Amino acid sequence: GVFRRCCEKTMEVMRNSQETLLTIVEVLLYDPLFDWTMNPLKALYLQQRPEDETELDQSFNKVAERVLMRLQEKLKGVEEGTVLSVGGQVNLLIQQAIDPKNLSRLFPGWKA
Amino acid sequence: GVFRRCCEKTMEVMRNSQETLLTIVEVLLYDPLFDWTMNPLKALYLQQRPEDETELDQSFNKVAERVLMRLQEKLKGVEEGTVLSVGGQVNLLIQQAIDPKNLSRLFPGWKA
């Protein structure tokens, strides 16, 4: 009714200004104090607590360019190579949400 | 008059069958007798003759995947990241032909 229409309405507000929203990530990722890369401790310190409850460098620039290309291909396109305009992209997004086959592969602490 | 309209008419015949024309390159590039990669001798044996007239491996698979992505992005898209549908793609193609600034950077034996 309203969710998908609002999504397809708010998804085209950045397609007319594609050359603007991507300029923030490129200037926030070239900072020296960046901590967005996966560290051996930062990727486990926030996930060992549910495990305990259950059991009672040029590589950085490479990953930066990779995620930049990923966020560039996320909008106005898809990883399948097709166009997938606002008429189908929001449907793909909302179908990747309500899917029990994928929800069974999620983290147990995600949803009770 | 006729050239650009014929180009924009013949360029959309493969956009409806994008999943077909790319299947020939992938099956003709995985042959053992391939000789499309730039060899130190094959890239100069066909160019040393004009010079004489003037003077009176995983890398192969990597380049194959690279040129595959290049030919995948050539149609229904452009390297600039924009869409560039048939209405502008043929105009961008014919603009790289009639351009003296670029023709001055061409090979002398290309055009007399």
Within an 8 Å CB–CB cutoff, is residue A69 touching chain B? no
A109 Cβ partners below 8 Å, 6+ apart? A50, A53
Residue of B75, B83, B86 for testing the chain A interface, max A β-carbons within 10 Å = B83
* Contact at CB, B83 and A83, closer than 8 angstroms: yes
Instruction: Name the burial class of residue B66, with classes exposed (0-12), middle (13-18) and buried (19+) by CB atoms within 10 angstroms of its CB.
Output: exposed
- Closest Cα of chain A to B92: distance in Å? 20
- Closest Cα of chain B to A100: distance in Å? 31
Structure solved via: cryo-EM
Query: Which residues of chain A does B76 touch, with a Cβ-Cβ cutoff of 8 Å?
Result: 83
Q: Which long-range contacts (CB under 8 A, 24 or more apart) does B81-86 make?
A: B81/A72, B83/A76, B83/A83, B86/B8, B86/B11, B86/B12, B86/B15
SS3 string of chain A?
CCHHHHHHHHHCCCCCCHHHHHHHHHHHCCCCCCCCCCCCCCCCCCCHHHHHHHCCCHHHHHHHHHHHHHHHHHCCCCCCCCCCCHHHHHHHHHHCCCCHHHHCCCCCCCCC
DSSP B54: H
